[PDB]
Amino acid sequence: MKLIVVTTPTFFVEEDKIITALFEEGLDILHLRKPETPAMYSERLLTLIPEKYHRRIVTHEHFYLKEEFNLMGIHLNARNPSEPHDYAGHVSCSCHSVEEVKNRKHFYDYVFMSPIYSTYTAEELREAQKAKIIDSKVMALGGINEDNLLEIKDFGFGGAVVLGDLWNKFDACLDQNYLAVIEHFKKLKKLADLEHHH
């Protein structure tokens, strides 16, 4: 299943290098989320990251950057609830209940589902799995890590979204490098691309 990574809410030096390094290791999709931030900073980061990885990035802010930097698409959210006037491209959003995903997933390229790890139940999750409600178009989000990654693909999720379990592996000015982040990503990607689980 796909392994989606969400950026950190704030901008930090070396972020562009780390992101590029993650793409180089096969990062499927990158969700650019920088709440309440001057567009300027988003452009700076996007400029540093190799053009060829632009169609693998979805932005939660300043939707105009979508066509400006040839991004993949946009993710509607509380602060940015609607696509631009005559937008044409990949659109996605978050849902927070089995019902929401049910009456909305077909209106998006894919949707997020959270909090998987708390408001749902492993059992109702399985019931929603057989009902085909959850499929390759729904991405699991919320409290995902190396300990429960396999449990998610077991649910039939078309992907897993991570943020903290990944970026928390790096502390600026305290670490001499970001190896731990890249090494930990490869580990998660190996579990995600690890078919056998039956």
Side-chain angles (χ1 to χ4, degrees):
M1 58 169 196
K2 290 180 174 52
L3 182 54
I4 305 166
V5 171
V6 183
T7 64
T8 40
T10 163
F11 286 91
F12 65 101
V13 291
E14 278 177 288
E15 187 186 7
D16 75 300
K17 273 69 167 295
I18 301 180
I19 291 174
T20 301
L22 296 163
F23 275 126
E24 284 169 44
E25 297 298 348
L27 168 60
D28 295 292
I29 302 175
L30 176 68
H31 267 248
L32 179 56
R33 181 171 169 290
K34 303 300 187 183
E36 302 285 307
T37 318
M40 176 196 296
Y41 301 132
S42 297
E43 294 175 295
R44 305 177 79 278
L45 197 172
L46 301 162
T47 306
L48 273 42
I49 43 189
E51 324 173 79
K52 66 182 200 168
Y53 295 127
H54 286 192
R55 79 264 222 153
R56 295 272 196 185
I57 301 172
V58 181
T59 177
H60 295 214
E61 285 79 24
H62 308 305
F63 292 158
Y64 84 98
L65 294 170
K66 193 279 188 182
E67 303 291 7
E68 192 70 354
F69 291 79
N70 190 53
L71 306 180
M72 187 170 112
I74 65 171
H75 194 72
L76 310 178
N77 65 77
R79 295 162 303 298
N80 309 80
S82 39
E83 55 195 0
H85 263 184
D86 278 291
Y87 178 72
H90 188 285
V91 61
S92 66
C93 75
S94 298
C95 297
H96 319 89
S97 72
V98 176
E99 193 189 6
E100 263 188 45
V101 180
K102 178 179 174 182
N103 322 311
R104 240 123 83 175
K105 59 191 285 296
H106 290 168
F107 297 110
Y108 294 95
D109 290 286
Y110 63 62
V111 306
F112 280 7
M113 196 193 139
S114 62
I116 303 299
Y117 296 102
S118 188
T119 188
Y120 309 105
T121 306
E123 197 175 66
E124 73 172 70
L125 231 60
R126 280 187 282 277
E127 304 286 50
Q129 179 183 338
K130 300 190 285 293
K132 303 297 178 191
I133 293 180
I134 161 179
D135 60 358
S136 47
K137 184 190 275 199
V138 57
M139 314 308 184
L141 160 68
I144 306 176
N145 59 30
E146 77 191 70
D147 288 341
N148 55 42
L149 195 52
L150 290 309
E151 198 158 60
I152 280 181
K153 82 141 62 185
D154 284 17
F155 282 118
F157 279 112
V161 184
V162 303
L163 204 166
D165 176 61
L166 190 157
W167 301 104
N168 292 164
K169 230 57 74 75
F170 175 76
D171 303 314
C173 303
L174 293 194
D175 284 310
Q176 226 84 64
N177 64 70
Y178 47 90
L179 249 165
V181 168
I182 313 305
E183 299 186 81
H184 186 66
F185 169 75
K186 292 190 178 189
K187 176 193 284 185
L188 303 178
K189 196 200 175 200
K190 182 191 175 187
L191 291 177
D193 302 350
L194 192 63
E195 162 67 314
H196 207 52
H197 65 292
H198 214 183

